[PDB]
């Protein structure tokens, strides 16, 4: 459905890596990911 990495879910942050690529930071379990949690639907 609607994705468009711009707004993130609760506990989810997004930052830029020195390489230029953006990565997501989950405040909940202190994990980082390069994958987009909006284009994948948890259900």
């Amino acid at each position: 459905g609607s994705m468009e990495q711009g707004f993130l879910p609760k506990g989810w942050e997004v930052r830029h890596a020195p390489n230029g690529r953006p990565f997501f930071i989950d405040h909940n379990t202190k994990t980082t990911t390069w994958e987009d949690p909006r284009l994948k639907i948890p259900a």
Binding site: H27, K30, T32
Partner: peptide
């Protein structure tokens, strides 16, 4: 190819 900085690392 490289891992991203940890939350405590970037804070």
């Amino acid at each position: 190819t490289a891992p991203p900085p940890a939350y405590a690392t970037l804070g």
